[PDB]
Amino acid sequence: MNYPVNPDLMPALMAVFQHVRTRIQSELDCQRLDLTPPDVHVLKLIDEQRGLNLQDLGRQMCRDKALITRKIRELEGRNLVRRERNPSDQRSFQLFLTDEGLAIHQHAEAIMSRVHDELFAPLTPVEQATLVHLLDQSLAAQ
Amino acid sequence: MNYPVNPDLMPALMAVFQHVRTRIQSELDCQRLDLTPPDVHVLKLIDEQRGLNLQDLGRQMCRDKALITRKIRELEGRNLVRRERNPSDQRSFQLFLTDEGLAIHQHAEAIMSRVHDELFAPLTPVEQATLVHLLDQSLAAQ
Numbered sequence: 566m567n568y569p570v571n572p573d574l575m576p577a578l579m580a581v582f583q584h585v586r587t588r589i590q591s592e593l594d595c596q597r598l599d600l601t602p603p604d605v606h607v608l609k610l611i612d613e614q615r616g617l618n619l620q621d622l623g624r625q626m627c628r629d630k631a632l633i634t635r636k637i638r639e640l641e642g643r644n645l646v647r648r649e650r651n652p653s654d655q656r657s658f659q660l661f662l663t664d665e666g667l668a669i670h671q672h673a674e675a676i677m678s679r680v681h682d683e684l685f686a687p688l689t690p691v692e693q694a695t696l697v698h699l700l701d702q703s704l705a706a707q
Numbered sequence: 708m709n710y711p712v713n714p715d716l717m718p719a720l721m722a723v724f725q726h727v728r729t730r731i732q733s734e735l736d737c738q739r740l741d742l743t744p745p746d747v748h749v750l751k752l753i754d755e756q757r758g759l760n761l762q763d764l765g766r767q768m769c770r771d772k773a774l775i776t777r778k779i780r781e782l783e784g785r786n787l788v789r790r791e792r793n794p795s796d797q798r799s800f801q802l803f804l805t806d807e808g809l810a811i812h813q814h815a816e817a818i819m820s821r822v823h824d825e826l827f828a829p830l831t832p833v834e835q836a837t838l839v840h841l842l843d844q845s846l847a848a849q
Contacts, residue, residue: 567828571835575823577842582724583748584846587764595769626733681717686709687848692841693713699830699838700719704726706829 581684588680598672605677607636608670611646611660618657619648645669723826730822735815742815749778750812753788753802761802787811 586602593600600608610622622633637660640646645666651657662670685693731744752761765775779802782788787808791801804812827835 568831568835570824570827571832571839573839574827574835575820577839578723578727578823579748579819581720581842581846582727584849585724586745587767590764590774591767591769594771594774597770623729623733626729627737628733629736677721678717681720682712683849684720684845685712685716688710688841688845690710690713692844693710693716695837696841696845697713697715697719699834699841700723702830702834703827704719704722707726707826 585677585680585684588683589676592676592680593673596672596676598669600669600673603636604640605670605673607640608645608662608666608673611662612667612670616659616661618651618654619660620657622660640666726826727822730826731819734818734822738818740811740815740818742811744815744819745778746782747812747815747819749775749782750787750804750808751816753779753782754804754809754812758802782808 589602589605592598593602593605607622611617614621619634619637620630622637637646637648641648644663647661647663648658649661651659685696688696728744735742735744749761752758761775761779765772768774779788783790786805789803789805789808791803793799793801827838830838
């Protein structure tokens with residue numbers, strides 16, 4: 566069941582998204598991590614989907630595939646990601662976080678967790694539970 | 708005052724962020740716009756005449772203090788942004804979107820608006836309005 570969407574929703578969500586992005590960028594820099602939030606997003610994808618093929622990155626989207634391969638080689642060079650040839654499909658490369666990349670991703674997850682705790686702590690338990698419900702409602706219909 | 712943080716909240720918000728960010732980036736790439744929603748943010752801030760907020764983002768950095776500066780120089784080079792001296796404080800420069808920057812910015816915003824319409828359509832008008840309030844309160848508290 567579909568409804569027209571309130572013109573105030575995009576700017577509200579986006580202002581929160583920009584606050585979170587800005588906090589994260591600033592924490593990565595200040596804590597000397599030297600990663601951009603898209604570096605952060607890629608390490609998280611590799612960690613979430615253990616062994617994913619290189620091509621499975623940005624799979625259900627329009628993408629410049631040369632760019633994703635450029636980013637991976639960059640992360641590889643930095644000792645954060647390693648590749649293994651996929652045994653079931655030798656033209657495929659499985660991606661894994663190295664020991665160092667796992668640690669860096671963990672540091673980044675912790676930063677993201679803190680930024681979110683800052684966002685949500687001011688809301689009462691009831692406001693927080695309502696928020697969860699409303700976001701889940703939007704997700705449960707995809 | 709801070710309350711305990713619902714453990715479902717961050718995962719829910721991150722899933723909405725992920726959905727939004729990947730869908731927007733995919734649409735921008737499908738149409739070959741050559742922007743990231745960070746190109747689009749800086750363009751929006753500039754159009755709404757908020758250099759206070761721009762310079763805030765660079766001042767939050769410890770090491771890469773020119774992060775924003777570099778982005779503005781790039782947009783200006785792409786002729787999306789233009790720079791005026793300022794009749795009074797001749798040390799500083801005022802920023803404006805060019806006619807190309809304006810059309811491109813408005814187009815990107817219309818893509819973002821569509822992605823939000825499709826994500827939040829399942830929610831009733833009161834549900835949407837509750838969501839706006841909750842996002843707004845969360846942020847105002849920061």
